[PDB]
Design a protein around this nucleic acid. Structure first.
Lengths: 56, 158, 76, 256, 167, 130
RNA sequence: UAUCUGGUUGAUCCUGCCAGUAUUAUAUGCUGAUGUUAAAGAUUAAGCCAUGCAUGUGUAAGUAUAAAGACCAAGUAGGAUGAAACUGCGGACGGCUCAUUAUAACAGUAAUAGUUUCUUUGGUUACAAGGAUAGCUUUGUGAAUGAUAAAGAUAAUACUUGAGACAAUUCAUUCAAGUGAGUUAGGAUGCCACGACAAUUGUAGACAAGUAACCAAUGAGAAUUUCUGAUCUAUCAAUCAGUUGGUAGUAUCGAGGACUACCAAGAUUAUAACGGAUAACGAGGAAUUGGGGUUCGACAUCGGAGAGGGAGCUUUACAGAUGGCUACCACUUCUAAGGAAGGCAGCAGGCGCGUAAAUUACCCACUUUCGAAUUGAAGAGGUAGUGACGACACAUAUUGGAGGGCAAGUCUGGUGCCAGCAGCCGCGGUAAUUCCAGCUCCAAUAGUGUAUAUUAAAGUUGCUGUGAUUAAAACGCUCGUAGUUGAAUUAAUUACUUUGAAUAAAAUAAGGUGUUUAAAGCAAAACAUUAUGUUAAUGAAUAUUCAAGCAUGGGACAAUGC
RNA sequence: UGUACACACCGCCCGUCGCUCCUACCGAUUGAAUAAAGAGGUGAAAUUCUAGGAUUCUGAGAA
């Protein structure tokens, strides 16, 4: 969806979630005015050893 | 200045507060387009005055000036896509001949009344404000929405 | 003054509002080496900028051209 | 102002960084080192903005303190290390190498490189003086001090460096038939061929340079940086190849 | 403290200069140290940026160079006989640059014996008189209030006549 | 002096001739800080001490009710109108009032005999709403 | 929108002002459905402060038998981790305010061949020694402070000595190449002082790590300095004696009357010196403008100065530091009466002052700074609360007025030159179009009146651009210096003009982009139905821009040529 | 023909004196108060130099 950034330095994959209506972290989600489309940004922290290490 | 953001005005009050010639002329535009108050007329006059000033500035320059070619084409392109200026008139001199009626005839309220979705220009305002009319993919509740030519045939009910 | 002269520069200052120039002048205290012995008052002098050599003397005479006389030949 | 300044307000940051004016009240002040404050791109700026590997200063530290970024051949752990000119930038975890090059829009752009061409670098000599003991040395625009050089290595030339060993591979004379990439004022990122070099006794040397498309412009000798000899470049230029589209083309190509 | 700024002076036009700031360390001066003649007494002064200046309060010995013979020897200072700036420096035996002083040419004489095989007690006539009288004339060329030592040279032909006639 | 290099006299003439502007000189010379009971302030506060009535000019007839006010900032004594109908009965004594100008007319204005100030508050809200 | 209208008269044409008008920005009256954005104790008092917080910092890598290690865990040089303490670094950045300040500061510009640290970066130059000190133990004083006394031990990357073998300073003489230009970087001779690359640290994350000097970068940085540029005032016309220069020295990081000794009489001024005022920090900029202009700028950002008033200093690379110290003046607080600390022009808040200005909130998650460092702090910063200062979009009701200027009533009830209205002309003496009310409609509208001030109107401050016979205004007349202006004419600078170089952003203009439009933001996506790709995607060329400075083509009009 | 009258010469209008109010000037009073420069007197304090060596460290020297 949208764009992919492969980020092995942070052991991470990040996407721009485009909703057409533990390793998962979701942030910055807001809908469009008048319902329907909702957008957001997702955080693929794969192994559960980065999530803790690389997570506030 | 104290704020790092930017704030700009959109309308100006007239110089002479009381004239009978101006009062009835504004009322003709209000009745023909169903405007809330004279602040909506003044925004159109301000918006028109800006483009008129731009065209007037470059008309005094030489025809082949690179400054005129860059700004003149950009001003005309913005006018064409907004639908205000018909595509045949591709000369800057036609911007000075524009009137406040041309801009007012491109508000979403006017189009949805002309397109027949509403019975009256006042019914168009109520229909727009009720989240009942969609332009392409996103619903709109602001009747001052100036529709482009590409979004002109994309108006339909909710 | 000894080994020192005062150089006057006459220039024109442009006043934007009236679109007209006005005559101004400034005095620069410069150091005159004893190499220029024929240097008197009224001569045309080319000066260059050096390190501060006094409280006000911050220039040095590089060349000079003699000019008309005024019955007062005040040499350096 | 009793001493050195440690903060840098966002609005005072160099323009070609393009820091958003509402993002915050501060900008990352680049720590001293090889390159000047306004001729450098801090390492945090490269990762967070130009590459999006990190989303904030917190995550830039995790990347750099993991010992995963190599500037030149060495590995730097300073979040505000000043990366300036063609100084190479290697990320071995992602197996990619970039070179910080200019472009016609007066900006720092990352030019991708191959592994074999990321092992070399071009440095511009700045001065050549006799050290103590009659030992000559050269100072490069990077800031490197290099011991006994070739006697022909004069002040304004360019040399090729072997990053793994630090030796000198190739040197290009600063003459009137060699390619140059400007690094200073309005010519920032422009590439052409030197055609005239006029000197004024007092103030400056002004160089006339002819662009590959026949355009001509002028710059100060300070901003000249020789890339190669005889219109042939030793480094791979950016996408625009040092050619400035004169306004109208750039506006029209952005419309399309 | 003593200041070296120009904000306390007057303009070239003679007009008084008004005050906007206060005294600052950048324009700070220090009390002069009049290096007299006597037992060795030096002090270390922390200057700006941490550097150290050797403030010589009192000295007796010094290194003096003979230009003609291309030698430099350590020598005890006897008297100060001429100061071109202030005569009060002569009585107090203050050691400053350009102060013509009198030193005993004992090491120089011994060096001449070992090198030529002769004794001094062509050279300018007044130089010989200083050798036989035991007091030769030398000029201090260091800044004892800054470097903490007296480095000088033995006066010679044209400089000797000018300074000898002054006495 | 209409010449190209005659900018000294042209600029110096406007400096001298500008001092003859009655409206401009008054706002520049040092009188707004010494001869103005109000001062630069738009409004001022004071204590009512006496209720006065001033007869109007010759072509008019009647008594203009007004009050005498002692300002706080300076301590001067002034006279202040009492706007619309029957507003003097609302004004008590030894209380704080807000005094605020008038237009300026030919200097004096609307209670005729030299009054130039109008009471806009009575401690309270308004010698309007009141 | 390059705009005017009422008022001198029986009436007319003028000069001319008063008033009206619009816009900003400060206060205030009345009033108020929302969403976005947003100023907010500057003006008066840089006046005074209760209370709370605003500067601290530990990794494997300086020192830790804490009698700390039931908590991982075991333990003969100390097992990972480790409170407090010594040592190192920092509190000189950031935050607040505008009192001082008139060529001072600041802006552009140029120099440092006249100075230069800290941090960071690139280089270069004995099989291991000596004491004592804190935290620790013990005994204590004082009402008390971030109060302090003795003794007994114990470590170093704390303090020293010491092999490992040059560098840098001063002086004297000398051989001399880049640079526009240097007895210049540099070499040689002799001498003095100084003198090294821890007598250092991880078993674990040879590799590290650390340390002293010296080169160079960082450094178009800091600091001094060059040229040009400021508001009003002549009821301020003469000012200056370290003042102006010279020599020698002193001091400083360094030039320099910065200071000292001797010498000479110089320096500035009608092109406005020296004075006086400012309700004066400078600039980028802001408000309003057809063009020209006028007014403002305490406050985003850059530069300067200050911490109640001066003054004097300590530490250090950087301070004349005040969330450091000492003394004097004026205050404030505790007290056991002996004594003691404290500086909100830091964030909240309180008193006072004034027309005039908000919570004694939560958190380091954003930006970034400091630190022994991926982790800790940060009233910097962010979020929240008050908020008709303002700006934008948007529902269905208030504010002012109804004689003219000026859109709107020759409607009805009271009032009777009274009360009053009235910015100006004026209306009111009983039949008021103007008072007080009722009804109606006039303007704007979630805004609308009032008061003060800026701008336009004002061609009523004039360069564009005024008037001088009679409206105000040609010296009584002539001579005259500075100043201003100067006939025609010819086949080295300056000025003028054209292009540039170089020059912080924000702001202004302007390019793109459906924040649902818009004010905004500089991002998001248009389509690829998008990981793939346009893509190494956008950063408007973003242009300015005056007065100086640098370069370039031309020499008509001009000045000094000589 | 002149006019400063237009309620139109029963017009208009000038100055002194008497009453009330307001603004500013001179004025004996070595008037008074506040603020800032100048000279001089006394002069804390910290730095620089000089004398001192209580103490403590080595077995006279150093601090």
């Amino acid at each position: 969806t949208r764009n992919l950034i492969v980020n092995p330095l942070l052991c991470r994959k990040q996407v721009v979630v485009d909703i057409y209506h533990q390793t998962i972290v979701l942030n910055g989600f807001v809908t469009k005015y008048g319902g329907g489309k909702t957008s957001g940004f997702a955080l693929i922290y794969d192994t559960l050893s980065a999530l803790k290490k690389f997570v506030p | 200045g104290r704020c790092l953001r930017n704030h700009s005005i959109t309308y100006k009050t007239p110089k002479v507060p009381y004239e009978r010639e101006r009062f009835d002329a504004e009322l003709k535009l209000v009745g023909q387009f169903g405007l809330k108050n004279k602040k909506e007329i003044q925004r159109v006059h301000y918006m028109l005055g800006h483009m008129r000033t731009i065209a007037k500035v470059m008309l005094m320059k030489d025809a082949k000036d690179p400054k005129r070619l860059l700004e003149g084409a950009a001003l005309l392109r913005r006018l064409h896509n907004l639908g205000i200026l018909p595509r045949d008139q591709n000369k800057l001199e036609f911007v000075l001949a524009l009137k406040e009626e041309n801009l007012l005839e491109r508000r979403l309220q006017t189009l949805v009344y002309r397109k027949g979705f509403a019975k009256s220009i006042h019914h168009a305002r109520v229909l727009i404000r009720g989240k009942m009319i969609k332009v392409g993919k996103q619903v709109v509740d602001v009747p001052s929405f100036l529709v482009r030519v590409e979004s002109e045939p994309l108006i339909q009910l909710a | 003054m000894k080994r020192t002269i005062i150089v006057r520069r006459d220039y024109f200052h442009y006043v934007s509002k009236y679109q007209r120039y006005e005559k101004r002048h400034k005095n620069i205290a410069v150091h005159c080496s004893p190499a220029f012995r024929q240097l008197k008052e009224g001569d045309h002098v080319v000066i260059g900028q050096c390190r501060p050599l006094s409280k006000t003397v911050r220039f040095n005479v590089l060349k000079f051209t003699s000019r008309g006389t005024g019955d007062k030949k005040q040499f350096a | 102002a009793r001493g050195p300044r440690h903060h840098l307000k966002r609005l005072n940051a160099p323009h070609h960084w393009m820091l958003s004016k509402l993002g915050g009240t501060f900008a990352p002040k680049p720590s001293h080192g090889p390159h000047g404050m306004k001729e450098c791109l801090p390492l945090i700026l490269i990762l967070r903005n130009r590459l999006n590997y990190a989303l904030n200063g917190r995550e830039v530290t995790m990347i750099v303190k993991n010992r995963t970024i190599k500037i030149d051949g060495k590995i730097r752990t300073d979040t505000r290390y000043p990366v300036g000119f063609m100084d190479v930038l290697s990320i071995p975890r992602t197996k990619e190498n970039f070179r910080l090059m200019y472009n016609t829009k007066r900006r720092f752009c990352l030019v991708p490189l191959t592994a074999e061409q990321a092992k070399f670098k071009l440095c511009k000599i700045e001065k050549r003086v006799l050290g103590t003991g009659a030992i000559p040395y050269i100072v490069t625009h990077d800031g490197r001090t290099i011991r006994y050089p070739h006697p022909e290595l004069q002040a304004n030339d360019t040399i090729k460096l072997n990053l793994e060993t630090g030796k000198i591979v190739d040197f290009v004379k600063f003459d009137i038939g060699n390619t140059a990439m400007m690094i200073g004022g309005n010519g920032m990122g422009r590439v052409g061929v030197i055609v005239k070099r006029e000197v004024h006794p007092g103030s400056f040397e002004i160089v006339h340079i002819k662009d590959a498309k026949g355009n001509t412009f002028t710059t100060r000798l300070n901003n000249v940086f020789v890339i190669g000899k005889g219109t042939e470049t030793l480094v791979n230029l950016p996408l625009d190849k040092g050619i400035k589209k004169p306004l109208l083309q750039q506006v029209n190509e952005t419309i399309k | 403290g003593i200041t070296r700024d120009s904000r306390h002076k007057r303009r070239a036009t003679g007009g008084k200069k008004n005050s906007m700031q206060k005294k600052k360390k950048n324009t700070m001066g220090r009390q002069p140290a009049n290096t007299r003649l006597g037992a060795i007494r030096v002090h270390d002064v922390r200057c700006r940026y941490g550097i150290i200046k050797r403030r010589a309060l009192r000295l007796e010995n010094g290194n003096f160079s003979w230009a003609s013979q291309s030698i430099t020897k350590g020598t005890k200072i006897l008297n100060v006989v001429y100061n071109a700036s202030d005569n009060d420096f002569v009585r107090t035996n203050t050691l400053v640059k350009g102060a013509i002083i009198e030193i005993d040419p004992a090491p120089f004489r011994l060096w001449f014996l070992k090198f030529y095989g002769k004794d001094i007690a062509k050279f300018d006539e007044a130089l010989l008189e200083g050798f036989q009288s035991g007091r030769v004339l030398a000029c201090i060329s260091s800044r004892p209030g800054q470097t903490g030592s007296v480095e000088g040279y033995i006066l010679e032909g044209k400089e000797l006549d000018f300074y000898s006639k002054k006495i | 002096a209409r010449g190209l290099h005659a900018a000294r006299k042209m600029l110096a003439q406007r400096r001298a001739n500008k001092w003859a502007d009655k409206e401009w000189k008054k706002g520049k010379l040092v009188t707004r800080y010494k001869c103005n009971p109000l001062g630069t302030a738009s409004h001022a506060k004071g204590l009512v001490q006496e209720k006065l009535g001033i007869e109007t000019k010759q072509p008019n007839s009647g008594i203009r009710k007004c009050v005498r006010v002692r300002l706080l900032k300076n301590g001067k004594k002034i006279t202040a109108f009492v706007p619309r109908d029957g507003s003097l009965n609302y004004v008590n004594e030894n209380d704080e009032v807000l005094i605020s100008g008038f237009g300026r007319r030919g200097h004096a204005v609307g209670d005729i005999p030299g009054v130039r100030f109008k009471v806009v508050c009575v401690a309270g809200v308004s010698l309007w709403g009141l």
